């Protein structure tokens, strides 16, 4: 659809989950935005 | 290593090759013996 969906510098109507603490099961929709914790530093629900 | 008495100079900075042993980085992380500790690409828990 590049001739259509592509808008200027970006299209924000389509978003994705970049990081997750575990693997999501098939046929399941998880909208949780909870901050992903890669290391041992506590995230406290915020970036860091 | 970081608690050793003397170090090499910066321009002379020394690289010690260490291999074939076991090490626990979770205790060194919780030992509170360091001023600053940061990892890139691998968390301190994943090291063990």
From Swiss-Prot, chain A:
Region described as Immunodominant HLA epitope recognized by the CD8+: spans on this chain: 11-19
Recorded consequence of changing residue 38 to V: Increased resistance to neutralizing antibodies
Region feature (Disordered): 18-48
Result after altering residue 7 to T: In strain: Omicron/BQ.1.1
Annotated region (Receptor-binding motif), positions in chain: 1-48
Domain of life per record: Viruses
Impact upon substituting residue 9 to S: In strain: Omicron/BA.1, Omicron/BA.2.75, Omicron/XBB.1.5, Omicron/EG.5.1
Effect of residue 40 to N: In strain: 20A.EU2, Iota/B.1.526, Omicron/BA.1, Omicron/BA.2, Omicron/BA.2.12.1, Omicron/BA.2.75, Omicron/BA.4, Omicron/BA.5, Omicron/BQ.1.1, Omicron/XBB.1.5, Omicron/EG.5.1
Function: Attaches the virion to the cell membrane by interacting with host receptor, initiating the infection. The major receptor is host ACE2. When S2/S2' has been cleaved, binding to the receptor triggers direct fusion at the cell membrane. When S2/S2' has not been cleaved, binding to the receptor results in internalization of the virus by endocytosis using host TFRC and GRM2 and leading to fusion of the virion membrane with the host endosomal membrane. Alternatively, may use NRP1/NRP2 and integrin as entry receptors.
Summary of subunit composition and partner proteins: Binds to host ACE2. RBD also interacts with the N-linked glycan on 'Asn-90' of ACE2. Cleavage of S generates a polybasic C-terminal sequence on S1 that binds to host Neuropilin-1 (NRP1) and Neuropilin-2 (NRP2) receptors. Interacts with host integrin alpha-5/beta-1 (ITGA5:ITGB1) and with ACE2 in complex with integrin alpha-5/beta-1 (ITGA5:ITGB1). May interact via cytoplasmic c-terminus with M protein. May interact (via N-terminus) with host bilirubin and biliverdin, thereby preventing antibody binding to the SARS-CoV-2 spike NTD via an allosteric mechanism.
The protein's name in its UniProt record: Spike protein S1
Organism: Severe acute respiratory syndrome coronavirus 2
Lineage summary: Viruses, Riboviria, Orthornavirae, Pisuviricota, Pisoniviricetes
Portion of the full sequence shown: 438 to 485 of 1273
Curated annotation (Swiss-Prot), chain B:
Glycosylation sites: 3
Listed result of changing residue 31 to L: In strain: Omicron/BA.1
Effect of residue 6 to K: In strain: Mu/B.1.621
Self-association state and partner proteins as the record states: Binds to host ACE2. RBD also interacts with the N-linked glycan on 'Asn-90' of ACE2. Cleavage of S generates a polybasic C-terminal sequence on S1 that binds to host Neuropilin-1 (NRP1) and Neuropilin-2 (NRP2) receptors. Interacts with host integrin alpha-5/beta-1 (ITGA5:ITGB1) and with ACE2 in complex with integrin alpha-5/beta-1 (ITGA5:ITGB1). May interact via cytoplasmic c-terminus with M protein. May interact (via N-terminus) with host bilirubin and biliverdin, thereby preventing antibody binding to the SARS-CoV-2 spike NTD via an allosteric mechanism.
Role description: Attaches the virion to the cell membrane by interacting with host receptor, initiating the infection. The major receptor is host ACE2. When S2/S2' has been cleaved, binding to the receptor triggers direct fusion at the cell membrane. When S2/S2' has not been cleaved, binding to the receptor results in internalization of the virus by endocytosis using host TFRC and GRM2 and leading to fusion of the virion membrane with the host endosomal membrane. Alternatively, may use NRP1/NRP2 and integrin as entry receptors.
Protein name, per record: Spike protein S1
Whole-protein residues included: 341 to 388 of 1273
């Amino acid at each position: 659809s590049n001739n259509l969906d592509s808008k200027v510098g970006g299209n924000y109507n389509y978003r994705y989950r970049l990081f997750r603490k575990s693997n999501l099961k098939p046929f399941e929709r998880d909208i949780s935005t909870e901050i992903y914790q890669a290391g041992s530093t506590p995230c406290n629900g915020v970036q860091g | 290593v970081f608690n050793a008495t003397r170090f090499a100079s910066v321009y002379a900075w020394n690289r010690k090759r260490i291999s074939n042993c076991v090490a626990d980085y979770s205790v060194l992380y919780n030992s509170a013996s360091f001023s600053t500790f940061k990892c890139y690409g691998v968390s301190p828990t994943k090291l063990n």
